Design a protein around this ligand. Sequence first.
Ligand code: ADP
Ligand code: MG
Lengths: 58, 393, 366
Amino acid sequence: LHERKCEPIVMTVPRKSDLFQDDLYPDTAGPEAALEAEEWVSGRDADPILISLREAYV
Amino acid sequence: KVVRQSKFRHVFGQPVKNDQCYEDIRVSRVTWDSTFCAVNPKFLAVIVEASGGGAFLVLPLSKTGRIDKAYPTVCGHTGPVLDIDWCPHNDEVIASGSEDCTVMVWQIPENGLTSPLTEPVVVLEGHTKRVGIIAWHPTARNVLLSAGCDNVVLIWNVGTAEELYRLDSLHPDLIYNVSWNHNGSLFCSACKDKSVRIIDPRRGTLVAEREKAHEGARPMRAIFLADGKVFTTGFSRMSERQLALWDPENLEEPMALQELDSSNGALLPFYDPDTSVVYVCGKGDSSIRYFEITEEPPYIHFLNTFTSKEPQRGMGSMPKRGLEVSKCEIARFYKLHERKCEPIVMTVPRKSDLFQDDLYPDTAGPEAALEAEEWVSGRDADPILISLREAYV
Amino acid sequence: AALVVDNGSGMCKAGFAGDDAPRAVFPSIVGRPRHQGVMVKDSYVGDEAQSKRGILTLKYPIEHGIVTNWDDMEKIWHHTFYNELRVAPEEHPVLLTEAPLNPKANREKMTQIMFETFNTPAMYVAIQAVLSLYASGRTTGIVMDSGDGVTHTVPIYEGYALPHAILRLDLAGRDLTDYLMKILTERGYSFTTTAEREIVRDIKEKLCYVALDFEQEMATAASSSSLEKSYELPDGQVITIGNERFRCPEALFQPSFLGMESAGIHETTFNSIMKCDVDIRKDLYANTVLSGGTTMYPGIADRMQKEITALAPSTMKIKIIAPPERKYSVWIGGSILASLSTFQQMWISKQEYDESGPSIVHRKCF
Ligand SMILES: Nc1ncnc2c1ncn2[C@@H]1O[C@H](COP(=O)(O)OP(=O)(O)O)[C@@H](O)[C@H]1O
Ligand SMILES: [Mg+2]
């Protein structure tokens, strides 16, 4: 963020191969909630739901 | 009894005249140790340096002399080209592997190139890394072997653009070179682990393996012989270049082991099944050494050596079909300098000017013995032999 | 045990990081026999070629800072690691040196050979001019690097280089050796073969010097024999040279002696500093550092200072820095830099290159 401009910056890992990189992209937390608010008040603890980024490869 | 019986003990090398060479060629500057040249009795193909992507220059043999810098080239790869190979059953077909992890097969026009060639006949995408090893099947038609840096060996049917076989869990390290056997049933491979492997592709099984064939860490080669043996050129613990002969039925010790020198540079062997003579050239070397392989011990007899004052960058060998039989020529070698390709004639001295039947036994013809589908079934056939008597003038 | 390798056009310097002097200093020449043997090795590299140069044709793999043939270039590196240092390249990180404004293609070939042919674990390549300032222990200055292949002037201010102000002069020691060869003909001495070239080079490194006033020196040599010096040829013959002692180095300041339209080193230094910003020219004037074997002519610094002072404004303080060890300033700076604790992160791993390629080499390098 500048004073009058929004500039995206891109960090990339230099890789010779153009295929999908399994190691670079492990399972990532998805947009699906693991547990609900009422369950949290009880004391339930769960890890974020993990998804795969392989399908995003073009 | 005093002299070992041979017909090639006095074979001498002679470079062609200046006008018969090819100059003004920007040879490729890739550190990959390959032949850098593929020649068939019609055309000459040499890997060249391109600013963008990779390309190799293909020119007719008659087009000698200086070459235009704007001469059209086969520029289809997006990365530098690693190796090239002409199709034995089609002199107008050449396969190329490059750093773009792909293999593209080209069809050259009869008269040569008038415009730069970019689109290939068939593209093969089966390797995750750069492909520096390509080998046409000696007998089966439209069958190509590719081995990339991913330690994966693939068999392709260029006619159908189909990957016939996949060999992955067979090479723990980088593969140096791969050579088919006589009938095309088996292929030998040289790997960075100093292990020589004989593998049946149609079955995907390791037939024989010799670990630590050469103790040196430098790159080493391995080729099949017509009779069915393996010739490996490698390095010793003291970094001395060695030549070894191996029996596939007994690999506990090599049949022969001779040391040439302590010079660097990988030794590229060139085998002539008709004469049973292997020509050993080293990258950056100014001399070519040729040896005769016979059943008499020590099974490796040094014949002679042609010596030059210039190191070569690569090497291409003319098959028997394109040689001048009338001049008692048994081999032609296209020495590649940094900016020039100098053909070298390997000549057997003979008083008689007539045809020499002994020097020229029947050689494999340009017609495939089998087809890809037939070979897949497991059919095995020797290459069809033709007669070189007709080439006499 | 990091290895510091400084490969020049004619000289190659190698050693271990932390040392105060290169362990291996041998000529960068490849010799091949030009005759036929009659008593029952096709190439010689380095001192062995020099010891057998009588029957060999000497060739320089590097010409004008350009690799004319990489096949002999690999031989130089192979001779360095195994025959000079007697070490395994795969076991030691190697620090490399590049000429200023080095082409990316040249660096890529240097990088590819190191990781593939020799399988070095880690390596890095640094600018020769920058390394020279490290040996001088300075952060701001202009270094003129005149070696065997080409002369370069690289100004550096507060650790920042100015590529636009970098100047190149295609005139170095090899051209002087050729110039000494041609001018020796007038005295009756003939030298034509490549073997004789090294002999002439030895005379140049031993009897040549820079005169403060060329015209006055010419008058002195034409009216006295005090400037005569005698050199003994390997065959026992002795030759005497007079004005040629200071005439050959004079080509540095008067390139027209070689027919070159370009100007001398003193001006080439002056244009380079004149090209940068006005606010940093003050530091560069007093921080002129001389590097390269071609700067060992006695009195060159005094002639250097006088010439630039005439070009530079009178108010300006001119200081010429000529350390006695500036012949190995590139190597000495490399050993110093490689010994630094903060240098460990500049290293490039072999595995990293195998997966990323030379792209990571163009970055992290200047
Ligand atoms: N004492 C000396 N006097 C004059 N010139 C010298 C002397 N020593 C070396 N040289 C010259 O320096 C050149 C090489 O210097 P240097 O820069 O150290 O190596 P390179 O140029 O190969 O990197 C040689 O061509 C040589 O002629
Ligand atoms: Mg130098």
